[PDB]
From a paper:
As the peptide-free dsA2 characterized above did not yield crystals, we used dsA2/GM crystals and vacated the peptide-binding groove of the GM dipeptide. To do this, we first alternated between crystal washing in cryobuffer (lacking dipeptide) and crystal cryo-cooling to 100 K (an “annealing” protocol). After two cycles of washing and cryo-cooling, we obtained a crystal structure of dsA2 at 1.75 Å resolution that is devoid of any amino acids in the peptide-binding groove (dsA2/peptide_free-1). There is one molecule of EDO in the A pocket, which mimics the N-terminal amino group and the peptide backbone conformation. The lack of peptide in the A pocket of dsA2 is accompanied by an interesting conformational change of some side chains. In the empty structure, the side chain of Tyr99 on the β-sheet floor of the peptide-binding groove has changed its conformation to point further into the A pocket, away from His70 on the α1 helix. There is no longer a hydrogen bond network connecting these residues, and the closest distance between His70 and Tyr99 is 4.3 Å. The side chain of Phe9, which is also situated on the β sheet floor, has turned perpendicular to the peptide-loaded conformation, and now fills the space vacated by the side chain of His70. We propose to call this peptide-receptive conformation the unlocked state of the A pocket, defined by the release of the hydrogen bond between His70 and Tyr99 and the upward movement of the side chain of Phe9. In the F pocket of the dsA2/peptide_free-1 structure, there is an EDO molecule that sits deep inside the pocket where the methionine side chain is situated in the dsA2/GM2 structure, but the conformation of the Arg97-His114-Tyr116 triad is the same as in the dsA2/peptide_free-2 structure.
Major histocompatibility complex (MHC) class I molecules bind peptides in the lumen of the endoplasmic reticulum and present tightly binding (high-affinity) peptides on the cell surface for recognition by cytotoxic T cells. To better understand the peptide-binding process to MHC class I, we have recently stabilized class I molecules by the introduction of a disulfide bond between the alpha helices in the vicinity of the F pocket. Until now, the study of the dynamic processes that accompany peptide binding has been hindered by the lack of a crystal structure of the peptide-free form of class I. In this paper, we present such a structure for the disulfide-stabilized form of HLA-A*02:01, and we describe the concerted conformational changes of the amino-acid side chains lining the class I peptide-binding groove that occur when a peptide binds. We find that both the A and F pockets contain side chain triads that undergo such concerted changes.
Numbering used by the authors:
A (entry chain A): 1 to 275
B (entry chain B): 1 to 100
């Protein structure tokens, strides 16, 4: 099927408490494979998946040089941004950057992403065409003028259509036991009496990969999304995912309630019943 | 400034069996800014060996971290996760409930 590679950078000012923090991580699909932490002793991009460990010293040297250079530009961006928003020198601020590529089933380029947030809000993003910029606020519009004049988007497009996809393809083959795998969810439902008069019904999906899943409850065939507590899909720690959905129902109506599961490892959507 | 409250889940990797070594997870997601304190607790005391994932974030820019450690569920030991963040007036303690 389709695959993706994404890099995530987080840059945080801490005035009076040293230079900004810079953390970088790399993912293929829902599997992390690299990190860099500017506060860590090693000062190296480090492996975080067994299949990247085999990369030679030119790779680790190259990636360390590149991520450090990114940390330095982000350091200076925190200044630009503070100045533009007229913010105090004392406060902590956060820049975030995400970028990467999607390929289809044929492993060919499908889409690219290159986007930035400041203090948890969109700042500037490269559009799907990889030529033009979305910039909401005035500060980001200033950035866009500078990046349009400097032809910044053409350099980013080259990485995203070429290099990003080349490396993704390599990783899919080297990490094929991990990344070309589907672990179908093991499903069940639990019941727990909250009192004499109502019960918590919880529908579980466990030990699945990839993370994408849908879990819904129906009452006599009506979706109960408004009344459902859906937790965020969460890591088991072993490279699989977990999720649950819960409804509180009147004691005795359990058989009116069905759970519905869709995951790529299922041949068909599954229905669990109190049956 | 934007602030978003951490969503806290405390859970085991595997279905718990008393006396059988397992992995305790505290997964905190949906939060902003990135500074956060997460501790796994046994009978109210911080577990010193705890590891965490590298800081990452979702499409909506909110952060997520996994804190984890080996543990052995028992009848009488009480496990929990304590989280503190700018959005919280005092640390929040979520008790591990194996019967969910
Ligand atoms: Na707080």
């Amino acid at each position: 099927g389709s695959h993706s590679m994404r890099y995530f950078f987080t840059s945080v000012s801490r005035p009076g408490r040293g230079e900004p923090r810079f953390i970088a991580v790399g993912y293929v699909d829902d599997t992390q494979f690299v990190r860099f932490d500017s506060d860590a002793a090693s000062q190296r991009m480090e492996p975080r998946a067994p299949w990247i460990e085999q990369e030679g010293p030119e790779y680790w040297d190259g990636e360390t040089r590149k991520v450090k250079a990114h940390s330095q530009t982000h350091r200076v961006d925190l200044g630009t941004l503070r100045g533009c928003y007229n913010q105090s020198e004392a406060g902590s601020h956060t820049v975030q950057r995400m970028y990467g590529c999607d390929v289809g089933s044929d492993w060919r380029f499908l889409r690219g992403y290159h986007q930035y947030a400041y203090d948890g809000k969109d700042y500037i993003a490269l559009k799907e065409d990889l030529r033009s910029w979305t910039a909401a606020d005035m500060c980001a519009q200033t950035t866009k003028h500078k990046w349009e004049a400097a032809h910044v988007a053409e350099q980013l497009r080259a990485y995203l259509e070429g290099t990003c996809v080349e490396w993704l393809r390599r990783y899919l083959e080297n990490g094929k036991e991990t990344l070309q795998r589907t672990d179908a969810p093991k499903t069940h439902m639990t019941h727990h009496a909250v009192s004499d008069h109502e019960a918590t019904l919880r529908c579980w999906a466990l030990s699945f990969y990839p993370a994408e899943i849908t879990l819904t409850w129906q009452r006599d065939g009506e979706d109960q999304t408004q009344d459902t507590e859906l937790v965020e899909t969460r890591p088991a720690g072993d490279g699989t995912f977990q999720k649950w959905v819960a409804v509180v129902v009147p004691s005795g109506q359990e058989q009116r309630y069905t759970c519905h599961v869709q995951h790529e490892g299922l041949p068909k959507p599954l229905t669990l019943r109190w049956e | 400034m934007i602030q978003r409250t951490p969503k806290i889940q405390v859970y085991s990797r595997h279905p718990a069996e008393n006396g059988k070594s397992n992995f305790l997870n505290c997964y905190v997601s949906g939060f902003h800014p990135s500074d956060i304190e997460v501790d796994l607790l046994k009978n109210g005391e911080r577990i010193e060996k705890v590891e965490h994932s590298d800081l990452s974030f979702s499409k909506d820019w909110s952060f997520y971290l996994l804190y984890y450690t080996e543990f052995t569920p028992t009848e009488k030991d009480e496990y929990a996760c304590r989280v503190n963040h700018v959005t919280l007036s005092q640390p929040k303690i979520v008790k591990w409930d194996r019967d969910m």
